[PDB]
Amino acid sequence: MSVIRGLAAVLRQSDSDISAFLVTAPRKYKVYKIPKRTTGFRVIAQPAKGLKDIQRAFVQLYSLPVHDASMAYMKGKGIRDNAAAHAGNQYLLKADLEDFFNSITPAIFWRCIEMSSAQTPQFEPQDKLFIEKILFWQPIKRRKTKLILSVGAPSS
DNA sequence: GGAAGCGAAAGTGTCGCAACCCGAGAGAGGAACGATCTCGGGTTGCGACACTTTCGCAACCCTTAATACGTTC
């Protein structure tokens, strides 16, 4: 069963238990408000411990392509490298993205899978439903089709 | 995404005011009958404004978080 089999192998848990856990998994988030530095609050949704472990095992199991221009969440690279890339230069064009993490839906993730220029792990159609449960957060309880990436999750 | 309150924005009805019309009437002149100006309703058009509808700001944070110290998203 591909993905669930690998997750069971890594997490030392039965396939049936992991499959049963990944049914209401997108709802398994605890959301809290962290203070902003000047004023206001920031809403962060953090998954439960079991879902966190599942996400960590999944991201360790499957390696997705990343670019060398990305300096965030990369091993050995951080703030200093990002700043030093433009240390010797004169003009700059700092830009931002509009609600970046919450704008990544399962449709976007699956679309980017199929048109990638680099190697992409092969996903069976049976596990494509489980991938969405593993990765994405479901912020409204009544709406089940609204799935977005949540900052504060290990896989995001 | 969107409680509960509330207010913006836009559309629609309404209602009072002005403007005019039309019949009644006392009676100017000058020798009678009724000119002419006013009283009392009545109708219509119009525009300011009240009323009506829709939208949008943004509580809470869901059962489900972790808690050596600092930046960053």
Automatic annotation (TrEMBL):
Q: Where is the signal peptide?
A: none
Q: Which reaction does it catalyse?
A: DNA(n) + a 2'-deoxyribonucleoside 5'-triphosphate = DNA(n+1) + diphosphate
> Which ranges form a coiled coil?
none
The EC number(s) this enzyme carries: 2.7.7.49
EC primary class: transferase
What are the record keywords, sorted? Antiviral defense, Magnesium, Metal-binding, Nucleotidyltransferase, RNA-directed DNA polymerase, Transferase
Which molecular function terms from Gene Ontology are attached?
metal ion binding; RNA binding; RNA-directed DNA polymerase activity
Record's superkingdom?
A: Bacteria
BP GO terms, sorted: defense response to virus
Per UniProt, residues of the Reverse transcriptase domain are: 15-156
Its family? Answer: Belongs to the bacterial reverse transcriptase family.
Name of this chain's protein = RNA-directed DNA polymerase
Coverage span on the entire protein: 1 to 156 of 311
